[PDB]
Amino acid sequence: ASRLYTLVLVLQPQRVLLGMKKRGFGAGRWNGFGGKVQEGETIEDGARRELQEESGLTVDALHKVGQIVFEFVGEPELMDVHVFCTDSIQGTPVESDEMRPCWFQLDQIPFKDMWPDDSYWFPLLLQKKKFHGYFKFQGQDTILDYTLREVDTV
Numbered sequence: 001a002s003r004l005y006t007l008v009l010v011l012q013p014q015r016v017l018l019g020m021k022k023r024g025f026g027a028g029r030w031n032g033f034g035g036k037v038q039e040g041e042t043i044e045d046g047a048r049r050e051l052q053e054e055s056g057l058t059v060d061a062l063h064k065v066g067q068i069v070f071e072f073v074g075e076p077e078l079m080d081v082h083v084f085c086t087d088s089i090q091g092t093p094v095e096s097d098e099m100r101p102c103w104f105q106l107d108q109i110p111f112k113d114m115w116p117d118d119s120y121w122f123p124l125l126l127q128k129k130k131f132h133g134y135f136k137f138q139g140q141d142t143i144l145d146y147t148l149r150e151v152d153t154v
């Protein structure tokens with residue numbers, strides 16, 4: 001039993017856009033933009049909607065780069081996250097109620113203030129390799145189990 005999520009990383013030659021989560025689950029961490037997929041929208045629709053709602057940006061093209069399943073101890077639903085990549089954006093990123101966006105040089109990604117799983121799978125994203133991941137959390141800090149592989153088809 002899974003629930004669909006989207007995660008969008010704006011990745012330009014020298015820099016990546018991240019958003020500081022301001023409230024709710026995972027507040028205080030930087031992450032890509034995304035969230036729950038709603039009924040009546042494609043997964044990629046959901047990804048553009050979340051990217052716009054949280055950063056003001058729209059995009060010409062989103063590219064599927066990964067899928068990650070998250071389990072949390074004691075939580076019935078799993079997160080089935082579809083990860084997207086884009087370089088060309090439309091607009092300038094602005095703060096939302098949810099997310100404060102900031103650019104980061106690729107050698108200054110704030111991994112210690114990001115979700116732990118990102119340290120595992122961000123490198124594959126940075127190499128523009130497609131991947132499948134699984135991460136079992138206990139709470140929001142401890143990864144009990146994980147798998148990670150490159151794929152031909154996300």
Ligand SMILES: COc1ccccc1[C@H]1CC(=O)NC2=C1C(=O)CCC2
Pocket residue numbers: 005006007025026031032033034035070079081115116117118
């Ligand atoms: C906006 O942040 C996310 C959107 C969709 C899925 C996951 C996320 C954020 C917040 C969240 O719930 N989980 C963590 C995030 C990651 O960067 C990868 C998994 C850990």
